[PDB]
Design a protein around this ligand. Structure first.
Ligand SMILES: [Zn+2]
Lengths: 167, 148, 490, 99, 99, 49, 718
RNA sequence: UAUAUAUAUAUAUAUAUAUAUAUAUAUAUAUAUAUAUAUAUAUAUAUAUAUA
RNA sequence: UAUAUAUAUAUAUAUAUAUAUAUAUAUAUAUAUAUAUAUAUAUAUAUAUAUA
């Protein structure tokens, strides 16, 4: 039967090391498992080559100017017979920034009762974030509506995360 | 269409139309130059242009090429049958219809539209050999055709 | 024979190709070497073929279709199966007493059908035959079906243009075979040095992984110059997906010629699938595929002669000067070109050197030259099988110092090929055998007086014959000797 | 200059009523003079010394016949072909590129 | 059809301003066609005869332009309406401003 | 013939030529029964072969 | 009545009961929905297009067709030759509706050369000296047309007169082809929408359906697709398939006025309650598939928040795979297994799909499934079905029932699909593991394995050269780096040619001459160089294999020999466009996945071939009973016994060349190859099968090896 | 030309069949609302058991 | 006092079944209108046969 609950921890095959996150396990496999100089060709230098290749992998980029270089393309008569997609119309909210709930407010039930009031208690969606700490972030077309859109967007996580990948 | 196919529009309210279908010459000039940059400047670039235009030309034209009247007017010339050379045969051996319906003619016309990119030249083989004399009849006929 | 595959010493790396165009891949501009030369040559020829109102002339179209039909043929059973498989109910004319396997018979069945419906049948089995030889392994006859022969038309056309417009087909026009006689005589004269070359097995060495893929890509690209929507020989234009750009893939129309290439490349990559049914052996028919080119008749000479010329030209002008050592050899190797120094037909080829001034080239340089050529052929898996003996071997003709030498052993007085367990012939045919037999003894210069005497004796025996009904009567007859005089015997 | 095209021959606007072969077009003039010149060549002394006059009489004859054929092409070049080019220039995927 | 078209015209008279009968678009000759093309000439004859039956106020102009179209070449008159030409399809005129 | 005469122009050409030929050969009285090479007989040659 | 013009996609199912289903099967889910559509698209028009396809350019064809009204009320009425045709007007005098003179009629009867006079002046007569558009222009008038040739386009073509005049003037199949048109008409109805394959002027009430897939290359009108698409694009007339399900049409996704949250939209709920006792108890050639958009997410941050994540589009995954696994939309399933690998069902979805792209753009990506990427995905959610249509499977990637070989790069997940999938059911016979051929089998056969021998030869080289080669292969920018890599390639080529080829050639029957073989290889060259008569399919999977094999550490080589071998095979492979391996998987396993959806039990079959007892005894075999022995070559499944028996009377024109050794290793060979399309599409075959005696107890002792030939005959079994 | 017979076409009438539309009745399906029953989940109360 | 399990009661949510109301679709029956086909009768026209 298909699983429905994520693993509580992740396991490497031989090191018996258990990890709370698969990312941590991934790094352990990425680094610690891969020195192992024991064969006729398991040299340290190739281990570095493999290690570099592992770190350098990214196969889900929209733009890839590195590999697009030297893509000499010949002019074709039929190719230019498409026309650009000019008509794109949106019925959603003309906005590109989102208010966030970066730190949720605590649910007090024994002491400090009444200091907090969630609109959910009245079955209402609040018009503003009601977290302990609220941030403004850039998430293009977060309220878009009507059709698919251009297909490339900018989405930044709250500053509690790295957000490095955007740059 | 050079004012052919004249047409007009009705006269009534058209509230919310939008037809973004146009651009300035500078845009066209820029695109044309860009188009010229993305090609191999050898014959490979020119050939599709000339070929396409030539096909369009042959597609729509009232002119019809037919050599029957010319030959009919040529073969009716009387000459002695006791001679060893009949220049009529020499002529008709030339002007050989290769069955391509004279692609060269339309090819030459199309080349004019893109003369700034490609030039049509007379084939080297279609020349009289420099070793010949004017009295060598095939050479003389060749020179005549080149002149024409 | 077909268990051989060429060994390439420097294969084209996979990274040397563009994105697919549905089946084919174009060659990256950055790639150089002989492959680049081959690619450009075929591409250029394809361009010239592309725009050519010589075709679409209805008369010319008739010539091509008519060229496909002969009294012989094969693979008819495979044809009937494949089309019946696809639900196509072909007509039959058995009461008209004509062999089904004849290429004529299958052609008649096809006449009504829309051509595109038949496309699935090109990937069908091909029968085979064998013809024995006097001084070598037996030859092979691999007749394609009419549909396959039709599809491969662009390959032939481009090859013809390459031949007729570069080195004038090296005598493959075959107008009268005697044009090679003065050629070899001149090639064997003292002032000239000649080298005999020939591909070890051109039929077995031409293949898709190296050769045909390049040709298919070049032809497909070479046909790009032309109306994308222009059916050719009933093959309409179609839509194919272009994946050259990983960021902007799409689909665009391609002309019928390109569609032919798309299927043709698919067939070549799949490899030919032959079915052997030898009668001399007992109950052992089977089928197995191979990359060996059919090469059953003169229709193959065009392709091999074109590739033969191309590789030789690149070797002379590029590879050899960059690689040879002797300065004198470089001096004489330059100022040399195929159109006035090299001829070929299929695998066979002749290379003659420019007249060394009142002198002859050092055998040392010759050895250096011949060695480098062997390595050059080894690069892309061609065993060149060259030799240097100051003689002329071309199309089985032998000349020594401008004198022709008839190799009589190749025409044995008693020997005759028979490719079937039964002779399957009737008595009067023996007369024609005698006539043909006598002429060889004239073509080859034998003692004309004694040869004539022997010939008449042969005629006398042949002059008489008989026959018996399967159950009934016998019959007999014989000719007066004056017949043979009329037939051409003094 | 934009929206203009150059043309190796002289040109005219499209005719009004029905067409017909003419003999004052530039091309027709070029043909006639060319033929006239070669006829003069054939009768030059250089040919007379070597070419039998009967054949010479024939050769000038056939050249004369060619000069008299009522072809339509010269008219078409001067009057109708430019229109076809002018229209098609707006149709081809690549606009004309002239010098 | 019991000549229903004929009766429709008469009926439309009593309801003009709510619905107008017009000469069917296909009835006109091709404006590029010449007067010599006899079927076109007969079409103009029919249109001219049937003109007054229709309730369209622009029928007079349309009838006139039909003949003018066929006579474009032999009778090159000037039409003082910007954006229009003697070769314009007759059925297109309509609005009074382009009379 | 159908395989040979894929189009119609060739068939029209051959038919016209054959019709004119026999008409001329008989009327001009050159001869009759002249087996002149013509496309209509090419399928016949194929069948015989 | 809004019209939607439709151009079929790559593998559009045509023999389907309703053309509508191949468009998007969701439209058939509700009666309230399916009642809103008409179809038209008649067969006679289809045949005409099939013919004219080879004789008109796209622009001409579009220009000709675009004016035709929806229900074609006109007919083309072929006239017989004048000598034949003239008699008709006198056989029925009132039929001389043009009233051609009797004198002229019998003058024609007398003439050796009956002229066209009988045709002359007949209104709307179309001589052979006419063109396609001439017909189409008259088609717009709706009245019937009289023609003098069969090659016509736009209207059904039927005889004007009884067949007696056309007989002799035409031949049997020609006389046959017009029969449906002789009584052509059928009504067309005024529902809300009407689909059509016939093009039309795009406008306010006509729309172009966009499916986001490649056209049917064989379909004659696919060439019109670019011009049509661009014209629609410039006026915003494209319709995504989902728009059809809404009550009112609009081009767009996520509209304001509709949440698009209804059972109709959920393509995963495939249901089949209705029945008609039809012979297709199931048509196992028609397969419903879906294109889905799935959102992928990584671990949350230290405060429970999560990154925006990325959504990708998976193409043409078979729907029954998801349904049988109880997959549901809007559920965030865990993506990663305990060991960090993907959960099996996701891998199956990827393997059987055609392509994976970024959701918005059209860039295809090869997904990684190892520990390479940082912040790797741990959760997956399917969001919506972009399309959901049935597709024809019969004989598409592979052609012969005998066997087929699939080539994949080293490191593919073939083990999962061949083991886990049948194990996930393990109740219905899918295949026999003894019949599937692992690509590594022959390499493992040599006494020192091919890998060991390659390693042993390889180490003789200087280590630095090897190190340089490995780095160059990994580093993409290292163009050629001839020295290091070429040296290794020479060793690889020399060894492989030396040892692998004869060993491969020695296993010929094992690859093909079994019941039904599924085989894997690292390159087509592995087979072509050995002359093995088996179809080879050059497949590809939408996952990065290089990184994948970099995680397999327990091998003979320390993960470095593997990449070397991988590069060598890829270099060895022939340059050609490879296909998605999912299509082949769909052809093989697809039909089986629909088994649990069935309502009635299956019925087994086979095509046993006889074996005379004489040769068996002559070969020293000890056998009881006189009746000839018979052997099961291949078993099949159906469910309607009635039609199944009705289809069992065909005599296959394919003999079997049975061969069996004394060790009871049994082999089969079909002298005429058995093609899959010849199998009636109501059947169902196992992925692999092994030939065996139908009754092993008949034999009492195996003598020597045996061979014989026999016919083939489908038969029932109990 | 006139009469009689037969065939075909057109018009009108009558009958029969089929299709489409509208009205009325009945049945079934789907959706929405309300009531009743059962199952599952969650919360609260009470009882009993076990652990702390 | 808290947690867990089991039983009972009450509340809320979801699913299924049944009843009632409203809307939509389909099928069947009856009535009316329109179209098409076939048969019969009458009239007119045309063709053919026979008689004068
Ligand atoms: Zn570990």
């Amino acid at each position: 039967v298909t699983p429905i609950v994520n693993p509580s921890s992740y396991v490497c095959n031989v090191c018996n090391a258990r990890f709370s996150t698969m990312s941590a396990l991934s790094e352990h496999l990425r680094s610690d498992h891969r020195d192992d100089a024991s064969t006729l060709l398991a040299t340290p230098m190739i281990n570095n080559a493999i290690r570099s290749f592992l770190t350098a992998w990214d196969g889900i980029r929209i733009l890839s100017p590195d590999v697009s270089s030297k893509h000499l393309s010949a002019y074709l008569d039929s190719a230019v017979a498409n026309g650009p997609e000019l008509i794109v119309e949106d019925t959603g909210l003309c906005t590109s920034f989102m208010l966030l709930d970066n730190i949720p407010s605590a649910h007090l039930t024994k002491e400090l009762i009444g200091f907090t009031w969630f609109m959910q208690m009245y079955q209402m969606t609040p018009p503003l974030p009601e977290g302990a700490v609220n941030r403004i972030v850039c998430m293009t077309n977060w309220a878009s509506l009507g059709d698919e859109g251009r297909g490339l967007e900018v989405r930044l996580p709250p500053p509690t995360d790295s957000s490095v990948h955007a740059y | 269409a050079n004012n052919l196919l004249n047409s007009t529009i009705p006269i009534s309210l058209r509230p919310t139309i939008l037809c973004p279908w146009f651009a300035s010459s500078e845009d066209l000039r820029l695109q044309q130059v860009m188009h010229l940059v993305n090609i191999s400047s050898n014959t490979a670039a020119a050939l599709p242009l000339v070929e396409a235009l030539s096909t369009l030309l042959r597609s729509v034209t009232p002119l019809v090429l037919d050599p029957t009247v010319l030959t009919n007017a040529i073969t009716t010339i009387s000459e002695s049958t006791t001679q060893t050379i009949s220049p009529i045969s020499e002529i008709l051996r030339l002007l050989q219809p290769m069955g391509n319906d004279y692609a060269a003619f339309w090819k030459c016309i199309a080349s004019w539209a893109y003369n700034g990119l490609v030039t049509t030249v007379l084939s080297e083989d279609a020349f009289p050999d420099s070793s010949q004399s004017i009295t060598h009849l095939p050479s003389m006929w060749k020179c005549l055709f080149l002149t024409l | 024979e077909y268990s051989q595959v060429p060994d390439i010493k420097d294969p084209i790396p996979p990274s040397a190709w563009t994105g697919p165009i549905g089946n084919v891949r174009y060659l990256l501009p950055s790639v150089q070497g002989p492959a680049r030369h081959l690619y450009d040559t075929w591409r250029a020829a394809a361009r010239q073929i592309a725009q050519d109102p010589q075709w679409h002339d209805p008369l010319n179209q008739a010539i091509m279709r008519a060229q496909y039909v002969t009294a012989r043929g094969g693979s008819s059973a495979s044809l009937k199966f494949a089309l019946k498989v696809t639900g196509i109910v072909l007509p039959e004319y058995d009461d008209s007493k004509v062999k089904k396997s004849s290429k004529i018979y299958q052609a008649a069945q096809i006449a009504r059908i829309a051509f595109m419906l038949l496309i699935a049948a090109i990937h069908a089995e091909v029968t085979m035959g064998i013809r024995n030889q006097v001084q070598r392994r037996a030859r092979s006859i691999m007749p394609l079906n009419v549909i396959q022969q039709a599809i491969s038309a662009p390959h032939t056309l481009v090859a013809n243009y390459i031949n007729k417009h570069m080195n004038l087909s090296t005598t493959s026009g075959s107008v009268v075979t005697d044009k090679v006689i003065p050629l070899i005589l001149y090639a064997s004269t003292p002032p000239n040095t000649v080298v005999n070359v020939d591909i070890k097995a051109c039929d077995a060495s031409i293949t898709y992984n190296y050769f045909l893929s390049v040709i298919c890509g070049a032809m497909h690209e070479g046909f790009e110059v032309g109306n994308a929507d222009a059916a050719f020989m009933g093959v309409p234009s179609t839509i194919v997906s272009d994946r050259r750009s990983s960021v902007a893939p799409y689909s665009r129309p391609i002309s019928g010629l390109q569609t032919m290439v798309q299927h043709l490349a698919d067939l070549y990559a799949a490899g030919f699938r032959y079915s052997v049914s030898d009668a001399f052996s007992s109950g052992n028919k089977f089928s197995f595929p191979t990359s060996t080119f059919p090469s059953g008749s003169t229709a193959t000479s065009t392709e091999h002669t074109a590739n033969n010329s191309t590789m030789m030209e690149y070797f002379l002008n590029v590879h050899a000067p960059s690689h040879v050592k002797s300065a004198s050899l470089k001096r004489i190797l330059t100022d040399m070109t195929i159109q006035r120094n090299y001829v070929c037909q299929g695998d066979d080829g002749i290379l003659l050197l420019p007249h060394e001034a009142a002198s002859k080239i050092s055998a040392d340089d010759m050895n250096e030259l011949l060695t480098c050529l062997r390595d050059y052929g080894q690069l892309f898996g061609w065993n060149y099988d060259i030799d240097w003996s100051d003689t002329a071997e071309y199309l089985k003709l032998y000349a020594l110092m401008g004198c022709r030498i008839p190799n009589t052993s190749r025409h044995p007085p008693v020997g005759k090929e028979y490719a079937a367990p039964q002779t399957d012939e009737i008595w009067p045919s023996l007369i024609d055998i005698v006539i043909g037999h006598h002429l060889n003894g004239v073509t080859d210069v034998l003692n004309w007086r004694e040869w004539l005497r022997f010939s008449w004796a042969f005629a006398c025996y042949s002059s008489r014959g008989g026959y018996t009904n399967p159950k009934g009567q016998s019959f007999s007859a014989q000719y007066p000797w004056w017949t043979f005089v009329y037939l051409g015997i003094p | 200059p934009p929206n203009r095209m150059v043309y190796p021959w002289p040109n005219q606007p499209l005719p009004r009523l029905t067409v017909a072969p003419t003999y004052d077009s530039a091309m027709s003039n070029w043909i006639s003079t060319t033929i006239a010149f070669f006829i003069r060549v054939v009768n030059s002394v250089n040919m007379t010394a070597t070419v039998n006059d009967l054949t010479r009489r024939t050769m000038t004859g056939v050249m004369t016949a060619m000069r008299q054929v009522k072809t339509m092409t010269p008219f078409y070049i001067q009057h109708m072909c430019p229109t076809e080019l002018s229209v098609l220039a707006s149709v081809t995927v690549t606009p004309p590129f002239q010098v | 059809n019991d000549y229903a078209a004929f009766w429709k015209c008469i009926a439309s008279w009593a309801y003009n301003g709510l619905v107008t009968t017009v000469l069917s678009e296909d009835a006109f000759p091709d404006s590029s066609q010449s007067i010599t093309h006899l079927p076109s000439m007969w079409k103009c004859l029919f249109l001219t005869l049937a003109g007054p039956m229709t309730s369209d106020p622009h029928s007079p102009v349309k009838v006139f332009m039909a003949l003018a179209n066929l006579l474009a070449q032999p009778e090159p008159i000037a039409i003082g309406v910007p954006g229009m030409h003697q070769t314009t399809p007759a059925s297109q005129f309509s609005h009074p401003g382009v009379w | 013939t159908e395989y040979l005469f894929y189009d119609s122009a060739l068939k029209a050409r051959v038919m016209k030529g054959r019709y004119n030929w026999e008409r001329l050969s008989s009327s001009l009285s050159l001869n009759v029964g002249s087996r002149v090479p013509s496309l209509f007989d090419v399928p016949g040659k194929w069948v015989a072969a | 009545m809004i019209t939607i013009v439709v151009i079929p996609t790559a593998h559009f199912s045509w023999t389907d009961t309703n053309f509508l289903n191949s468009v998007d099967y969701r439209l058939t889910s509700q009666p309230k929905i399916r009642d809103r559509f008409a179809v038209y698209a008649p067969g006679w028009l289809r045949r005409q297009l099939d013919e004219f396809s080879a004789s008109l350019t796209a622009s001409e064809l579009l220009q000709a067709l675009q004016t035709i009204p929806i229900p074609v009320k006109a007919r083309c009425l072929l006239l017989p030759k004048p000598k034949r045709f003239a008699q008709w007007l006198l056989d029925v005098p009132s039929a001389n509706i043009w009233h051609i003179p009797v004198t002229t009629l019998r003058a024609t009867v007398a003439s050796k050369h009956p002229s066209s006079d009988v045709y002359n002046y007949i209104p709307d007569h179309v001589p052979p000296s006419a063109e396609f558009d001439t017909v189409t222009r008259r088609v717009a008038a709706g009245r019937d047309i009289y023609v003098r040739s069969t090659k016509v386009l736009g209207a059904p073509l039927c005889l004007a007169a009884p067949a007696k005049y056309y007989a002799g003037y035409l031949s049997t199949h020609q006389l046959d082809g017009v029969y449906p048109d002789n009584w052509a008409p059928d009504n067309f109805h005024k529902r809300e929408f009407c689909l059509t394959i016939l093009p039309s002027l795009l406008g306010p009430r006509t729309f172009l359906l966009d499916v986001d897939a490649d056209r049917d290359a064989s379909y004659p009108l696919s060439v019109l697709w670019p011009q049509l698409r661009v014209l629609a694009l410039k006026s915003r007339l494209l319709l995504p398939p989902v728009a059809l399900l809404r009550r009112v049409v609009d081009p767009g996704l996520k509209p304001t006025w509709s949440a698009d949250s209804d059972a109709a939209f959920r393509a995963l709920r495939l249901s089949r309650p209705s029945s008609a006792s039809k012979p297709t108890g199931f048509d196992f050639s028609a397969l419903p598939v879906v294109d889905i958009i799935c959102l992928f997410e990584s671990e949350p941050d230290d405060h429970g928040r999560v990154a925006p994540g990325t959504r990708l589009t998976i193409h043409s995954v078979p729907t029954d795979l998801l349904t049988s696994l109880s997959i549901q939309e809007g559920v965030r399933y865990p993506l990663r297994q305990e060991s960090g690998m993907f959960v099996p069902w996701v891998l199956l979805a990827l393997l059987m799909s055609d392509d994976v792209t970024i959701s918005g753009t059209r860039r295809s990506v090869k997904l990684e499934t190892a520990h390479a990427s940082a912040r790797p995905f741990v959760h997956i959610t399917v969001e919506r079905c972009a399309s959901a249509r049935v597709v024809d499977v019969r004989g598409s990637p592979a052609m012969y029932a005998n066997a087929v070989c699939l080539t994949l790069p080293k490191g593919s997940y073939k083990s999962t699909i061949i083991d886990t999938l049948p194990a996930m059911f393990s109740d219905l016979s899918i295949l026999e593991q003894a019949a599937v051929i692992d690509s590594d089998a022959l390499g493992d056969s040599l006494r020192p394995s091919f890998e060991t021998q390659f390693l042993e030869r390889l180490e003789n080289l200087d280590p630095k050269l090897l190190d340089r080669a490995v780095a160059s292969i990994l580093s993409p920018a290292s163009d050629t780096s001839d020295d290091a890599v070429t040296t290794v390639l020479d060793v690889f080529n020399a060894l492989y040619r030396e040892v692998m080829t004869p060993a491969q050639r020695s296993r010929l029957p094992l690859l093909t001459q079994q019941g039904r073989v599924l085989a894997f290889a690292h390159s087509d060259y592995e087979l072509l160089s050995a002359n093995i008569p088996i179809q080879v399919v050059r497949g590809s999977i939408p996952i990065d294999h290089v990184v994948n094999l970099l995680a397999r550490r327990n091998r003979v080589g320390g993960t470095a020999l593997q990449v070397l071998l991988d590069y060598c095979y890829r270099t060895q492979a022939s340059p050609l466009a490879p296909t998605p391996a999912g299509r082949l998987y769909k052809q093989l396993f697809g039909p089986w996945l629909m088994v649990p959806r069935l309502s009635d039990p299956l019925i087994k079959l086979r095509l046993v071939a006889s074996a005379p007892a004489k040769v068996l005894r002559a070969a020293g075999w000890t056998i009881d009973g006189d009746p000839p022995l018979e052997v099961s070559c291949l078993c099949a499944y159906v469910t309607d016994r009635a039609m199944a028996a009705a289809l069992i009377e065909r005599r296959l024109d394919s003999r079997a060349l049975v061969n069996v050794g004394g060790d009871q290793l049994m082999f089969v060979e079909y002298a005429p190859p058995l093609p899959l399309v010849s199998i009636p599409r109501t059947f169902l075959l196992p992925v692999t099968y092994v030939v065996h005696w139908v009754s092993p107890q008949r034999v009492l002792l195996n003598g020597g090896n045996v061979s014989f030939t026999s016919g083939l005959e489908w038969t029932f079994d109990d």
